[PDB]
């Protein structure tokens, strides 16, 4: 895999989103990875529905949190609608997939990266955007404006985001806090520190969709 990856440069990343007050980061993270894998496999960059996963992932808890792996499973076993067909409302509602016509895209499964393994995570990013988790509760993370973030932060992961690239000393993260947070909505988190958890627990739980 190469020294630099940045899926934005390869037209595989949609604009930065804002999850709002809703604890729907798990759905935003999954959707980032679906938009990426659909671009990689088909050549078209589309936006898909975080709200659909929020409403319909019966293993997640709506705005009280959820599981990126479960949302990616949901997209692999049914499919997902375009974001515009099923726009984000920032509140959990009744599942409306059946009422929104045929699904726009469908994947074939979801694989997990080996946890606590930086190279394994980098390997997946070189193939596609990956759903990752991290500790976002620290004010240092909350107030991040730019640069390669090294913390302070613990390994208490609580926030799902998406890794869309990396470099020799960082992993590139698409967050769901709007375009005004971080580096136009992104954070570069230091890698290569030798901490197996990853900086901010970044290596705790990583999933990506599979689409043949």
UniProtKB/Swiss-Prot annotation:
> What is the activity regulation comment for this entry?
Repressed by the active-site-directed cysteine protease inhibitor E64 (L-trans-epoxysuccinyl-leucylamide-(4-guanido)-butane) produced by Aspergillus japonicus. Inhibited by the inhibitor of cysteine proteases from Trypanosoma brucei (TbICP, rhodesain) and Colocasia esculenta cv. Kaohsiung no. 1 (CeCPI, tarocystatin). Repressed by leupeptin, a peptidic cysteine, serine and threonine protease inhibitor.
| Recorded GO MF terms | cysteine-type peptidase activity; serpin family protein binding
Which residues take part in binding E64?
25
Active site as annotated: 25, 159, 175
Q: What is one GO biological process annotated to this record?
A: proteolysis
Instruction: For this UniProt record, give its keywords in alphabetical order, as a comma-separated list.
Output: Allergen, Disulfide bond, Hydrolase, Protease, Signal, Thiol protease, Zymogen
Its activity depends on temperature as follows:
Optimum temperature is 50 degrees Celsius. Unstable upon 65 degrees Celsius.
Q: Which cysteines are joined by disulfide bonds?
A: 22-63, 56-95, 153-200
| The protein's Enzyme Commission number | 3.4.22.2
Give yes or no: UniProt keyword Disulfide bond: yes
Q: What class of enzyme is it?
A: hydrolase
Q: Which parts of the sequence bind leupeptin?
A: 25
The UniProt family comment states:
Belongs to the peptidase C1 family.
Biological function: Cysteine proteinase with a high level of diversity in substrate specificity, an amino acid bearing a large hydrophobic side chain at the P2 position is preferred.
Q: What's the protein called, per UniProt?
A: Papain
Natural source organism: Carica papaya (Papaya)
Lineage of origin: Eukaryota, Viridiplantae, Streptophyta, Embryophyta, Tracheophyta
Q: Which residues of the full protein are shown?
A: 134 to 345 of 345
